[PDB]
Ligand binder design. Structure first.
Ligand SMILES: [Ca+2]
Ligand SMILES: [Cl-]
Ligand SMILES: [Cl-]
Lengths: 99, 109, 97, 87, 98, 88, 114, 98
């Protein structure tokens, strides 16, 4: 008797929720650390303007959201509904990001 | 001496012809710059600017908002066939995406 | 101490906004986006113009270069209205001198 | 003092539910468990290429701070032009 | 009596044409097309012969590359045959198509 | 008298099936659905329009009536299909 | 009075430092051009040219051919992971493509050659 | 008229470098055309980015340091190391000649 939504229905609901919005979807501090981690590998003791870290995050999430759209088309192309890493790898190969 | 009229005012333009003209001379595009150029360029910059704000404004109205914000610009651009092409490799911060859910992913009812 | 001058297109975007939607306003973030746009396209047109003049062995970017640059860079209908509005503005600026 | 920067393995801070949200915006309905790690690697490669160029722009300017323009010029070079942070 | 199985002469041709560098579209038809497409931009146009070659070189390169990408989409859907949806998905993902 | 040029129509069909197959072969295609050949023609035509448009634009800016390999080379660069061996 | 020493020889280059320096000044890049800019640049162009020529020359030699042809340049470039990336949105007229047939398209049976 | 105008190229140089690298191999005109396109392509990329750099940092001057930073930006890993190396060596040698 307790209410339960069939699988797909809360997912479809999330899609709508997030397509309506523009908030960044990666949590800010984790992101900010990762950037600095990665930045060490090229130069030591670098500071960032916070707008520089926001500009990167804006740019990343935009690229990933974009890549997911192409990944979803590749998944559907093969008569599926479930994105899998070969979808991502195909998208990026056709995109020419990858060999 | 005669009175100062701006070149924008002479062109019936809101964009700064004089500034554009200086940006052209100072941006390493050519040794020389004709006086028609910045007038024409500032013109096009004004047209496209107006075009986007026409469409961005309508989206702010549909959203019951007095002020244009990035999402309104993004909706304006991504629903207009030509503006989208013009800006097809451009990311608009804080814009989000157009609502799109492939048909196959919807319920059968 | 007064901050050093960062120019922008923001008084001109507003002026156009009042022409087009007298009741409507604009946030900082939107203005930043408008301003990025204007610079982007400035550089695209000016760039293609620089190439055009250079390909044709000429020292001078004229309106004829800006125009052919516009033809190459903007899509059909957008190209047409730009060319019209750019011609208007010149033809007009010439008659005033 | 000078407070060393501890490389904590933050790529794992890019959580599963975060990756899932990004995919919802992208219109993805269903997600293989293999996705969340594939993504992290895809994200890392993205971040390295942008941050390398950005930091190159920083170095040439003889600055110790990466600015938002360094990042913008970087994304322009990588063909991923960003509006709203200058330029 | 003698006959090869389907796909055998196909593979043979793949080997043949990846080994060579000659243009594969026939030159005069290609030229006629160029002239025709050009007419919708400016009447009574002339063409340097190298400009036509330059456009054929480009086209053929464009298409050969598109077919590579098209094949991968076919194979991704567990197919050996290319179909228009494979060309469409490739072109969608390349940014050419809406 | 003297007469200027005349109209050509549906030359896209001169891009035959064998040649479409040959191109696909070079692209490593083994089996081709029969709807490909008309799709490929569509795609090829869009490519040529976009490149010839831009080349011809360069022609008229040079106040010429002859399209030159450089007009094509410059157009293809703008299209991001930079080509080597014709005047780069 | 005492004359005639070409900047390129000074730098130890075949590439023309003076042509390169002229091309920078006249090419709408910057108001001024410093004296190392064209030396450095010419050197880099010489370096990349010499790589491709080395590799393509090898390709022509494997072909039992005295002369380099576009295919020798293509084969050189596309089998060098790095040259391939530098020149990945670039089309080499008359180069063709590298031999390559996806495995799912082959037949699978092995029974072999002499 | 009577004599066609002069159109510069890097041919003599490409050849000079060719004799260094392989003394007994030649080069067809098409192949040489590709090499000339190559040099001009890259010149334009490096000068281009050098141009941005200077402008981005409010310098009027493209110096050897802008070429270097641009070279780091445009070439991939190994190629850029050797490229910066040869660029560094050449400027060095050139100041020694004085
Ligand atoms: Ca209105
Ligand atoms: Cl003018
Ligand atoms: Cl210098």
């Amino acid at each position: 008797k307790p209410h339960r939504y069939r699988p797909g229905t809360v997912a479809l609901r999330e899609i709508r929720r997030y397509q309506k919005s523009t908030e960044l979807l990666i949590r800010k501090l984790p992101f900010q650390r990762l950037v600095r981690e990665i930045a060490q590998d090229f130069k030591t003791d670098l500071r960032f303007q916070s707008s520089a870290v926001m500009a990167l995050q804006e740019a990343c999430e935009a690229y990933l959201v974009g890549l997911f759209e192409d990944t979803n088309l590749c998944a559907i192309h093969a008569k599926r509904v479930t994105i899998m890493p070969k979808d991502i790898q195909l998208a990026r190969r056709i995109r020419g990001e990858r060999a | 001496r005669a009175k100062a009229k701006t070149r924008s005012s002479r062109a019936g333009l809101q964009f700064p012809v004089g500034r554009v003209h200086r940006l052209l001379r100072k941006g390493n595009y050519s040794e020389r710059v004709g006086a028609g150029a910045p007038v024409y360029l500032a013109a096009v910059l004004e047209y496209l600017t107006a075009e986007i704000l026409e469409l961005a404004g309508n989206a702010a109205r549909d959203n019951k908002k007095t002020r244009i914000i990035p999402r309104h610009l993004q909706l304006a651009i991504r629903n207009d066939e030509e503006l989208n092409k013009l800006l097809g490799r451009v990311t608009i911060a804080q814009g989000g995406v157009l609502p799109n859910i492939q048909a196959v992913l919807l319920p059968k009812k | 101490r007064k901050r050093s001058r960062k120019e922008s297109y923001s008084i001109y975007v507003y002026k156009v906004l009042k022409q087009v939607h007298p009741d409507t306003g604009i946030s900082s973030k939107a203005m930043g986006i408008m301003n990025s746009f204007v610079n982007d396209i400035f550089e695209r047109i000016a760039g293609e113009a620089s190439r055009l003049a250079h390909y044709n062995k000429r020292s001078t970017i004229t309106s004829r270069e800006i125009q052919t640059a516009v033809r190459l860079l903007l899509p059909g209908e957008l190209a047409k209205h730009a060319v019209s509005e750019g011609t208007k503005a010149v033809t007009k600026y010439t008659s005033a001198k | 003092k000078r407070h060393r920067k501890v490389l904590r393995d933050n790529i794992q801070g890019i959580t599963k539910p975060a990756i899932r949200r990004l995919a919802r915006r992208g219109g993805v309905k269903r997600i293989s468990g293999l996705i969340y790690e594939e993504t992290r690697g895809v994200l890392k490669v993205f971040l390295e290429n942008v941050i390398r160029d950005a930091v190159t722009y920083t170095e040439h300017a003889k600055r110790k701070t990466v600015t938002a323009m360094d990042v913008v010029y970087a994304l322009k070079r990588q063909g991923r032009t960003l509006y709203g942070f200058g330029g």
